[PDB]
Amino acid sequence: LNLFTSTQEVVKEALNKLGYDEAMYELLKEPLRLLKVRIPVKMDDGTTQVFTGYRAQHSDAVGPTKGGVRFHPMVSEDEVKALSMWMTLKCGIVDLPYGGGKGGIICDPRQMSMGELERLSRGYVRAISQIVGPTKDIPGPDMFTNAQIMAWMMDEYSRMDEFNSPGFITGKPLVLGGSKGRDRATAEGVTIVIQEAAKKRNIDIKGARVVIQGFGNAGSFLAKFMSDLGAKVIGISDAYGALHDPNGLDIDYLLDRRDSFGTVTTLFENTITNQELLELDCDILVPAAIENQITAENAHNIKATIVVEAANGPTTSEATKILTERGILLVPDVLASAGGATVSYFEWVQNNMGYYWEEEEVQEKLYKKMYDSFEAVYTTATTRNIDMRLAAYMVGVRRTAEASRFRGWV
Amino acid sequence: LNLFTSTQEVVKEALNKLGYDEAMYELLKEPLRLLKVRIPVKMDDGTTQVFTGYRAQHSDAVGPTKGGVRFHPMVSEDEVKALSMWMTLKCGIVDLPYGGGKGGIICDPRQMSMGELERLSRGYVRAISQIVGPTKDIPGPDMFTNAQIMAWMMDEYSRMDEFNSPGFITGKPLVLGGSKGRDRATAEGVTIVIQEAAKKRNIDIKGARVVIQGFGNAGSFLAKFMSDLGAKVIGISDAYGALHDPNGLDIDYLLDRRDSFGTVTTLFENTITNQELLELDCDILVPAAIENQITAENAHNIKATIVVEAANGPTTSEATKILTERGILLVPDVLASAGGATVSYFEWVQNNMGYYWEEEEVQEKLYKKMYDSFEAVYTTATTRNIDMRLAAYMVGVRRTAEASRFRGWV
Amino acid sequence: LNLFTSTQEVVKEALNKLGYDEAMYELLKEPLRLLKVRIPVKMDDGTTQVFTGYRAQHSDAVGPTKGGVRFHPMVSEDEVKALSMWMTLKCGIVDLPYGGGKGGIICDPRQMSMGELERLSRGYVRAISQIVGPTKDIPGPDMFTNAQIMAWMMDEYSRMDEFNSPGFITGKPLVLGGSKGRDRATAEGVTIVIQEAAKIVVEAANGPTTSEATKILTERGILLVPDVLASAGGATVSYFEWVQNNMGYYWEEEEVQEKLYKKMYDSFEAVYTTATTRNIDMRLAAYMVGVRRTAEASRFRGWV
Ligand SMILES: NC(=O)c1ccc[n+]([C@@H]2O[C@H](COP(=O)([O-])OP(=O)(O)OC[C@H]3O[C@@H](n4cnc5c(N)ncnc54)[C@H](O)[C@@H]3O)[C@@H](O)[C@H]2O)c1
Numbered sequence A, B: 001l002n003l004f005t006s007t008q009e010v011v012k013e014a015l016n017k018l019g020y021d022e023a024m025y026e027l028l029k030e031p032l033r034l035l036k037v038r039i040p041v042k043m044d045d046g047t048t049q050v051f052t053g054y055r056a057q058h059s060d061a062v063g064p065t066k067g068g069v070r071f072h073p074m075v076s077e078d079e080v081k082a083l084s085m086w087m088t089l090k091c092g093i094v095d096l097p098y099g100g101g102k103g104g105i106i107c108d109p110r111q112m113s114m115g116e117l118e119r120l121s122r123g124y125v126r127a128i129s130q131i132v133g134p135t136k137d138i139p140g141p142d143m144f145t146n147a148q149i150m151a152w153m154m155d156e157y158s159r160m161d162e163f164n165s166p167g168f169i170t171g172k173p174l175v176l177g178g179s180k181g182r183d184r185a186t187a188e189g190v191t192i193v194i195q196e197a198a199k200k201r202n203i204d205i206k207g208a209r210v211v212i213q214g215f216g217n218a219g220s221f222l223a224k225f226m227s228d229l230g231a232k233v234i235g236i237s238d239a240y241g242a243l244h245d246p247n248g249l250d251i252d253y254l255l256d257r258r259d260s261f262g263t264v265t266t267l268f269e270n271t272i273t274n275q276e277l278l279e280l281d282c283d284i285l286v287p288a289a290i291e292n293q294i295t296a297e298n299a300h301n302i303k304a305t306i307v308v309e310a311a312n313g314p315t316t317s318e319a320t321k322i323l324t325e326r327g328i329l330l331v332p333d334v335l336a337s338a339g340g341a342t343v344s345y346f347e348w349v350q351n352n353m354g355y356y357w358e359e360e361e362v363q364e365k366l367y368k369k370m371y372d373s374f375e376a377v378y379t380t381a382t383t384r385n386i387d388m389r390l391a392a393y394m395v396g397v398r399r400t401a402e403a404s405r406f407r408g409w410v
Numbered sequence C: 001l002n003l004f005t006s007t008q009e010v011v012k013e014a015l016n017k018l019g020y021d022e023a024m025y026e027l028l029k030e031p032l033r034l035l036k037v038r039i040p041v042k043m044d045d046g047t048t049q050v051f052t053g054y055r056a057q058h059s060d061a062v063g064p065t066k067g068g069v070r071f072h073p074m075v076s077e078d079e080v081k082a083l084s085m086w087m088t089l090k091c092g093i094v095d096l097p098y099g100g101g102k103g104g105i106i107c108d109p110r111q112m113s114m115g116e117l118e119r120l121s122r123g124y125v126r127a128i129s130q131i132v133g134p135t136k137d138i139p140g141p142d143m144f145t146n147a148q149i150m151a152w153m154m155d156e157y158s159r160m161d162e163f164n165s166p167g168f169i170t171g172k173p174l175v176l177g178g179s180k181g182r183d184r185a186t187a188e189g190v191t192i193v194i195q196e197a198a199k200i201v202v203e204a205a206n207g208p209t210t211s212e213a214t215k216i217l218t219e220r221g222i223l224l225v226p227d228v229l230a231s232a233g234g235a236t237v238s239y240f241e242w243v244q245n246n247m248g249y250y251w252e253e254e255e256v257q258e259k260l261y262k263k264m265y266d267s268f269e270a271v272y273t274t275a276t277t278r279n280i281d282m283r284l285a286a287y288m289v290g291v292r293r294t295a296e297a298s299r300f301r302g303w304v
């Protein structure tokens, strides 16, 4: 179950199918740089608490590295190293001039005050500033970090520099150089990939039977988005149960009666199980709940033409192979959710020029990137007769392998 | 700064204006009981996790205490204490035979399965059963809890009793003794207070000018209600702007353009600002969005005869003094939102009798309870020449202080 | 033939058409608790006779259980089990906060004296008291039991409690907390399903139609009102006696009548709807409305 060694296997199988040699795996199986730091913080009670921080930079062969920072009690070195590698793949799937980066601090932010989080954000930037910046390694928001933390981190970096460096970090508030169209960008990308998968199977959304798992932020918005496309949303589900209407659920009713924590099954008596919801006959199954939802146990039972992953990691390895050889078009999470990294990149470009796009322009620019990435992965999947996940990994890693070779590193 | 100490300040000022001694505040400033439990739960991986739970019972002078149980990572002992005191004030305002209670468990329900939450729910009932029950302390839903969690807790308690105790806990499924007429109880309650405030100012609702700020859950509901009663809803808003039509905005058409975050403004961009929305001349202004919308800078320029808080804290203290000085009838949020507690109470009564009311009967009784509360707070404010928020507080504490004296506790 | 297996298949068909799976039938096909007792009674000639008694509590997922007590030479464990399950269904149809219960003593009341019957009635309450009472299991009259039997069992329970618990047992005399409108109740129930049948065959509560005759009558577009629905006035007024006992407040015949009509009204439009929207006979639609609430409760509470 170890993430990092599992991530290495992803890189190894993709470099190996691309035809690169053992030397190339050895170069890419670990970050080029990993910086571990100890950040003293003056806490609100006057004691100094010392926090462990990490910043991984996987490969900068293609450009500066990119990836967010998370504040979690369970952050580890192996976690940060693995996710920096996943960032490399995410950037390449959508063709950014970026290698993968990642940072983490071991702390419980929910147990710290405003002033403590700011002082820890500043001390983090102080601790790593020698290897980061607009041209080296660009952090961004992640678990338990948000625009205010990006704003403190930017101010600290810019004071050290003696000038404004908004391109240091992405996810900034608008007034600090943030990018319009940033909040919806991941979900909008799932919307493009859904509509692009539908064309590949010549499935008209209007009247198509679609079931989505989950009814929180991702699931609310995806059930509403397909209901307004005229599609029939015959199933939605909760942590507590699921709903099924062969004629299509009244999404606007559920939407109205849901509570602020993504639950709505609870109001209802007639209720079906999540496991039965996944096995419903439908055109588009969209898992938007949680991981390991389609497994070797139900992979032969799901009868959807298209499965777009909105949750992270909802299909297991053996289930992915079972789905592809049943003809099902599986769009992997690492492609479906690439809208967030793409708009991070747009923010950094705006900071480089000093000129800022309108929302309609970011959307236009965001749409083509997704439309183009989907086609790159789909074409690699079908040309090489592989599942779209491995094809996505291959598209994800090949720029870094090509650049590493050209620059003389292998 | 802090909610508990801020809640202590509210109880102190109310008891002071009612005329009690310093002893009465010494009795009421902290809950009579506070139970902190540790709950071990078997997790799905087989390990054991030990969770922290709290149950606060503010004052049982008037009857058993009443209040919900929240499952949140940010639950704290001071928060549970302070909210129990708020439940006393609520139960007082609407004249229930209850005192204030509340619970909380420090967990992240988002990282827990359905089985983990059930076992935690049963372990919490087990851990506090000695001091709660139909006649002692009656819990209910709150943040991250729901009718399924109430069903589990009611089952655990009944198992412990060796007989069915539906009145232990409210928010139950109907098949386990919950109340009809519950789902929109809080929103119906604001609707009653708006109409009753309107008749005080001798305003015909059937042609009145209504401005609502916010267009999510509450704003969308209030707007359709006012639209139906014949009111002209001349303004609505969301986070991105506001719409204005002097003759009525056509709510049914707007409720169809909603995007699942409760946004409608982006589609028009012949839009007015939130600031201007709030100062439009009208009869009934209803801030049903965020907080601190009516402030010292705002309040001199609001033009509504009546302001009904349908969100928590949208009017500041400075602003509250001003609207009272300008002769605007302000309905505080602690009063306008009391319908959820009222219908909680009706579920408990029906449990006591073993007899259950139709939707219509629950509605009739809810109206009379909300009218009587509005009338009681209006008479305290008008008789003492004070603002309605301080009057609401005073009605809310009055019964507990009168009962505490009568039973000899002070 | 055997009432019990016959009733198990009734539950089985209704559960399966409502969509639950086998585990709900496994929970609901036998009672959660069945208590068999031996009651020593002193007879008039100074001898001791020992009697067998049963109490069946089918399911309390919805609330305390409810059903009558019969004194009969042919009382049997299977009869008592099966009849408590019919109580679940009768309560479900009128939408009562009750599960099904039933009890019986194997005895010949006609060959017993008044004194003997009282000493038996008391020994029954003492035998089963640990699992009965106004919040757990509420008995009542049935074959060869009546108000006087109920008064003796109520008095024995109260004595054991050290306080009056009228809510223990229904069919009590008025002066002991019984309900007005009771003697008419079951008859009025039929009188009311007849009247809503207007907007037509109404059964006589024993079980007078065979499986195939209900198939022929329904396929001929003739409306049928099953026994388990039309007889439900008795269970309804029973519930009203309990609620009045819970309050300590007692209604006039007029009000007991208004509330009985409303209940039989809704119970007819629930079975009628269920037969029209699913194109089934009303008897099967009645078993479904009867077992529905108990099924959903067992599911919410975590039992299956
Ligand atoms: N916009 C996107 O598509 C997007 C972006 C980022 C992440 N995600 C992923 O989507 C998933 C949900 O994200 P979110 O913001 O909607 O979360 P959320 O917490 O707001 O909503 C989660 C939903 O999943 C349900 N759920 C939880 N456990 C479940 C279970 N075992 N079975 C079924 N349903 C269950 C919850 O009850 C709720 O309805 C996560 O895996 C996350 O990584 C999606």
Ligand SMILES: NC(=O)c1ccc[n+]([C@@H]2O[C@H](COP(=O)([O-])OP(=O)(O)OC[C@H]3O[C@@H](n4cnc5c(N)ncnc54)[C@H](O)[C@@H]3O)[C@@H](O)[C@H]2O)c1
Residues within 6 Å of the ligand: A260, A261, B213, B214, B215, B216, B217, B218, B219, B237, B238, B239, B240, B261, B262, B263, B274, B288, B289, B290, B311
């Ligand atoms: N999850 C939590 O921690 C949490 C916290 C507070 C409340 N809640 C719950 O959330 C629900 C809130 O109901 P609601 O009716 O407020 O719905 P909502 O939050 O779904 O929508 C609120 C509306 O206000 C709008 N809005 C936001 N900022 C605005 C601004 N500055 N000016 C004008 N409009 C603005 C939103 O766009 C939307 O139209 C309640 O159930 C409440 O108990 C949850």
